[PDB]
Design a binder for this molecule. Sequence first.
Ligand SMILES: Nc1ncnc2c1ncn2[C@@H]1O[C@H](COP(=O)(O)OP(=O)(O)OP(O)(O)=S)[C@@H](O)[C@H]1O
Ligand SMILES: [Mg+2]
Length: 211
Amino acid sequence: VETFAFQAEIAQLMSLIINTFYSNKEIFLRELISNSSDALDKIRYESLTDPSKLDSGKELHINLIPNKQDRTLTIVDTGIGMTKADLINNLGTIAKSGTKAFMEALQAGADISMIGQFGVGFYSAYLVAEKVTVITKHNDDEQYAWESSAGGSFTVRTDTGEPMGRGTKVILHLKEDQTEYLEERRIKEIVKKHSQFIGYPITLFVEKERD
Ligand SMILES: Nc1ncnc2c1ncn2[C@@H]1O[C@H](COP(=O)(O)OP(=O)(O)OP(O)(O)=S)[C@@H](O)[C@H]1O
Ligand SMILES: [Mg+2]
């Protein structure tokens, strides 16, 4: 297991998200679905000139899986996935140019929904989750698990769980006061409100394709 420090301003942002009250937390799901859709675009376009990139799975889609027993909400996609370098670089150690400006915007009264436009949308997960685990598999790399409960660091380790063909699984360990995001009707209303025009199928467990 390898431990990494979040870049200083990313750590500051995560603390701000965790310790300051914001309404409109529901946009976390929009941000994660957008990341899945971006990842699905990437593998789709790559496959146009190299169809073998889909040997690890041809279906391009997103699954939403609430688990009330475990208090988790999982967002799974069959997008391009992340290499180990991708996880380390893109999910915490490299500075984002918009982080400081976003925190200044929040202090001035901006809605938390603006988080994606500032280039730090992933961290919206911490509005509702005490811990986030990201399991990911990219072609020509092994499967990895990234994990953080905030506090300034994350870990990365080779994953020996259920093999994915290709893509990313974001597992949100929800805070005790945010279990509304495990409810069927709640998930449907948020998807309808915020993710209506995503260009890949979205399926809610346990069985239902959302249109
Ligand atoms: N499901 C995923 N599959 C592959 N890569 C991902 C996934 N989720 C996040 N990432 C990576 O994490 C990076 C950071 O995600 P975000 O913080 O949402 O920022 P961003 O999506 O690059 O910027 P936007 O368009 O303003 S939300 C992405 O650019 C991807 O490289
Ligand atoms: Mg994003």
